[PDB]
From a paper:
Except for solving the quaternary complex of PaBcmG•FeII•αKG•3, we did not get the other two complex structures using SsBcmE and SsBcmC. The DKP ring interacts with F248 via π-π stacking, while its two carbonyl groups form hydrogen bonds with T156 and S175, respectively. The 7-OH of 3 forms water-mediated hydrogen bonds with H154 and R81, whereas the 2’-OH group forms a hydrogen bond with the phenolic hydroxyl group of Y288 which couples with the amine group of Q94. Furthermore, the C-3’ is closer to the iron center, which is consistent with the result that BcmG catalyzed the C-3’ hydroxylation. Likewise, the comparison between PaBcmG•FeII•αKG and PaBcmG•FeII•αKG•3 structures revealed that the C-terminal helix may function as a gate or lid for the active pocket, and the binding of substrate triggers the closure of this gate. Combined with the crystal structure analyzes, we speculated that the hydrogen bonding interactions medicated by R281, Q94, H154, T156, S175 and Y288 and the hydrophobic interactions mediated by F96, F248, L280 and L284 stabilize and orient the substrate 3 in a suitable conformation to favor the C-3’ hydroxylation. Moreover, the hydrogen bonding interactions between Y288 (also interact with Q94) and 2’-OH drives C-3’ in substrate 3 to adopt a catalytically active conformation for hydroxylation. Collectively, we speculate that BcmG performs exquisite control over the site selectivity and stereoselectivity mainly through the directed guidance mediated by the hydrogen bond between Y288 and the 2’-OH of 3, similar to a directing group control strategy in chemical catalysis.
Here we report the mechanism of three Fe(II)/α-ketoglutarate-dependent dioxygenases in bicyclomycin synthesis, which depicts the natural tactic to sequentially hydroxylate specific C−H bonds of similar substrates (cyclodipeptides). Three αKGDs (BcmE/BcmC/BcmG) catalyze site- and stereo-selective hydroxylation of inert C−H bonds in BCM’s (bicyclomycin) cyclic dipeptide scaffold, one of the simplest peptide derivatives without additional functional groups. Our hypothesis posits distinct regulatory mechanisms: BcmE employs steric hindrance, BcmC relies on inherent reactivity, while BcmG utilizes a directing group to control C–H hydroxylation. Although these three enzymes share only 35–42% amino acid identities, the overall structures are similar, and r.m.s.d. values are 0.70 Å (SsBcmE vs SsBcmC), 1.07 Å (SsBcmE vs PaBcmG) and 0.87 Å (SsBcmC vs PaBcmG), respectively.
Residue numbers in the entry: 7 to 300
The structure:
């Protein structure tokens, strides 16, 4: 099975098959053509952030193990996992200017703009009235949301799963990758997904699934994982722009569900939801999934 694919053209997702969008929201995953988007700075960071900083050209992209939660905020910065191959760097948008080199800041901003264009184009196809969009998606459309550029370095010397089964937490994720390894759950079976040059992989997160579950057009967020990587040639990396609701509780009170004819119902505390699913992603015998309520 091949995922649907689209081009973003003036706020409109044009899929390359008549059933493309229908398949995308059933599959939880689809491809989108990259606009003119230089990826060199992110690729450099993805190959260097975990290395010790040494004098030279690579130095500004190295040594980021020094950026931990105490210098940023909870859930931010560098993490080495015990029972996953990934070592990771998470960074929310409010820290990008302080922490990222200039070229990576600019790439992050361009990926953020593109990701929100993708989100608006998806919402435009759903039975969700525009007057509710800003509140319903956690104020991320008015630039008060939670935007991470997050990097995965798959340490092939670690004998463990590559990245545990999980759902992403938020609205859309725009994923930059080069190699096989991603598998998505489809009709009860694990489907390998390979990246495509000049394209990003897009997927929906839990917030999208919760918002639309009881609407006329429900959208799936689907479980996915990365296979254990074995040694030999460059380590696998990936990185992605994750779009999430605001984490400030006076800006966004949590995750909503839309009930047509009634309005938005506040279903879940988002920070609690996020803290739980994040922790469960990286333990030995749990998974990054959630139990649907009601
Ligand atoms: C909100 C933020 C996570 C918390 O900081 C964001 N959401 C996600 O779902 C993933 C988490 C992952 C699957 C990599 O564990 N990545 C992110 O950057
Ligand atoms: O590395 C990949 O292909 C997937 C990464 C992923 O799912 C994530 O970071 O949430
Ligand atoms: Fe993911």
């Amino acid at each position: 099975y091949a995922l649907a694919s689209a081009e973003l053209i003036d706020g409109k997702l044009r899929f390359d098959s008549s059933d493309g969008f229908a398949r995308a929201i059933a599959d939880g995953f689809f491809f989108v053509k990259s606009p003119s988007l230089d990826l060199a700075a992110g690729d450099t960071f993805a190959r260097n952030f975990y290395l010790p900083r040494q004098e030279g050209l690579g130095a500004p992209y190295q040594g980021f193990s020094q950026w931990t939660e105490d210098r940023l905020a909870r859930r931010e910065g560098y993490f080495s996992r015990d029972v996953d191959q990934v070592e990771q760097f998470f960074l929310e948008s409010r820290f990008w200017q302080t922490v990222f080199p200039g070229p990576l800041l600019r790439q992050a901003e361009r990926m953020r703009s593109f990701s929100l264009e993708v989100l608006r184009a998806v919402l435009a196809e759903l039975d969700l009235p525009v007057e509710l969009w800003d509140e319903a998606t956690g104020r991320c459309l008015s630039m008060q949301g939670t935007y991470h550029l997050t990097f995965n370095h798959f340490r092939s010397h670690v004998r463990a799963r590559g990245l545990n089964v999980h759902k992403d937490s938020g609205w859309v994720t725009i994923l930059r990758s080069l190699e096989p390894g991603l598998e998505v759950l489809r009709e009860g079976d694990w489907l390998p997904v390979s990246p495509r040059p000049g394209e990003f992989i897009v997927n929906f997160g839990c917030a999208m699934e919760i918002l639309t579950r009881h609407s006329a057009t429900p959208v799936a967020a689907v479980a996915h994982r990365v296979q254990e990587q074995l040694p030999g040639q460059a380590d696998r990396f990936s990185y992605a722009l994750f779009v999430d609701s605001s984490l400030d509780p006076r800006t966004c009170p949590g995750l909503f569900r839309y009930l047509p004819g009634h309005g938005l119902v506040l279903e879940a505390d988002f920070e609690m939801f996020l803290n739980e699913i994040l922790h469960n992603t990286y333990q030995e015998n749990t998974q990054g999934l959630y139990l649907e309520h009601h």
